[PDB]
Design brief:
The structure is a homodimer. With 229 residues, the first copy, chain A, is α+β, with helices and mostly antiparallel strands. Chain A folds into 2 domains: 80 residues, Signal transduction histidine kinase, dimerisation/phosphotransfer (DHp) domain (Helix Hairpins), CATH 1.10.287.130; 149 residues, 2-Layer Sandwich (Heat Shock Protein 90). The first copy, chain A, is built from 7 helices and 7 strands, in the order αααβαββαββααββ. In chain A, helix 2 packs antiparallel against helix 3 and helix 4 runs parallel beside helix 5. The two termini of chain A are 13 Å apart. Chains A and B meet through helix 1, helix 2, helix 3 and helix 7 of A and helix 1, helix 2 and helix 5 of B. The complex binds adenosine-5'-diphosphate (2 copies).
């Protein structure tokens, strides 16, 4: 099919686009360190300016973001594999088992409302496995007492819903939650790349992600992935 | 299965990393622009400042590098969309003719051991044209006296071998030579080459050359109708 040709062409482009991101992340360190040596010079080779202090906090922010990018890009290349057929139960049963154990260790509870069936998917098993893993990790951290995971299926695809009873996220901030480096003031008191990685991985797999208010009181994350024909 | 479903699936695939790169860029550019505006205020207050000068050029370099990744990302999108059938001779004959002239101007020599024939390829002609152009310009710069270009074909694909009598690259550095902005002593040439060749379902290798310098081997599959 023409569609199969287009998917393969775009899959190849996604590889070259990941190679690009990781490589320039390593490259950004070189002018950043040279910039910081300039701000380190003027710090005692001239007065302790409030102006120079303001340039150093901007350089600090840049450094912080570049370091987070290196941590991110390391995995988005190492863990990047060829696209294969995988069943939803095979793919996510281990993630859900480890998450239930981690919850139990925190005195919290993880309930799987409806389990993943043998529903066929197509893509990178590690990327899809980590996409659910990052959502559930956030739920484990921010929930007060409980986490809920629910699977749904139909002719078109699989819907995964992760709920928690913690504080949620305001409707304004739920808009920017998937943005790279975005962190709510509650969390600021973590890189902010987690949900950015999740959104990209799921969009690369021809699906979508949503952040909503949870019936449990906290945050609800909804992943949709297409069924493999 | 519907046409709208197929367009949405491809739209998600096409724009996924573009948007991540774009959003990361905006996020990096918030403290970077503030830094650049801050240093411009202090440079106007005191012009004679070699330290502020250095901070300004490093910030400029950061901005320029972030811009290069966005431009390259956009070019990778063009490569996936724009694809036509092209013959190896039509595609690379001009590159080899201009390179031979440039070599002659430097007192150097460019020898085409075996020329490209009317061998069919499929993809982005500009991406594949620039892939050879970047390899040959590198050979023209780093060679001492000679450059050699050799084409090979079979039922599966075309092998292009570019040799030079220059210094070469150490086996350790030949591993990191295809990374963007990379140097030894823009640095985007071999980066443009590797991503474009891999997007075209081919491969690139850096090896020691029998001429003494660097050997670059490109392999591209043949177009089978
Ligand atoms: N389940 C949740 N409950 C409350 N806030 C959350 C939850 N998940 C994510 N967030 C908020 O969204 C922000 C962005 O999430 P994320 O990208 O995963 O960041 P990080 O990688 O630092 O953990 C977090 O810093 C936090 O403020
Ligand atoms: N023929 C060669 N001989 C020696 N070194 C080379 C050769 N070709 C490339 N290099 C080295 O590999 C690096 C990466 O190449 P490239 O991306 O094309 O950079 P540039 O933008 O300077 O052409 C160059 O900066 C150079 O140090």
């Amino acid at each position: 099919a023409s569609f199969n040709q287009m998917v393969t062409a775009l899959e190849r482009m996604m590889t070259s686009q990941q190679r690009l991101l990781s490589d320039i992340s390593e490259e950004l360190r070189t002018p950043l360190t040279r910039l910081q040596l300039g701000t380190a010079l003027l710090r005692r080779r001239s007065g302790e300016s409030k102006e120079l202090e303001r340039i150093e906090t901007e350089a600090q922010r840049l450094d912080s973001m570049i370091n987070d990018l290196l941590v991110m890009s390391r995995n988005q290349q190492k863990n990047a594999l060829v696209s294969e057929t995988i069943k939803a139960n095979q793919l996510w049963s281990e993630v859900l088992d480890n998450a239930a154990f981690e919850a139990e260790q925190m005195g919290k509870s993880l309930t799987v409302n409806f389990p993943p069936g043998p529903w066929p998917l197509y893509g990178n098993p590690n990327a899809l496995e980590s996409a659910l893993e990052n959502i559930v990790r956030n739920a484990l951290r921010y929930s007060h007492t409980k986490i809920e995971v629910g699977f749904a299926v139909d002719k078109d695809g699989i819907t995964i819903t992760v709920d928690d009873d913690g504080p949620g996220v305001s409707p304004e901030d739920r808009e920017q939650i998937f943005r790279p480096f975005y962190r709510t003031d509650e969390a600021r008191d973590g890189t902010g790349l987690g949900l950015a990685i999740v959104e990209t991985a799921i969009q690369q797999h021809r699906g979508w992600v949503k952040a909503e208010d949870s019936p449990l009181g906290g945050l609800r994350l909804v992943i949709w992935l297409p069924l493999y024909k």
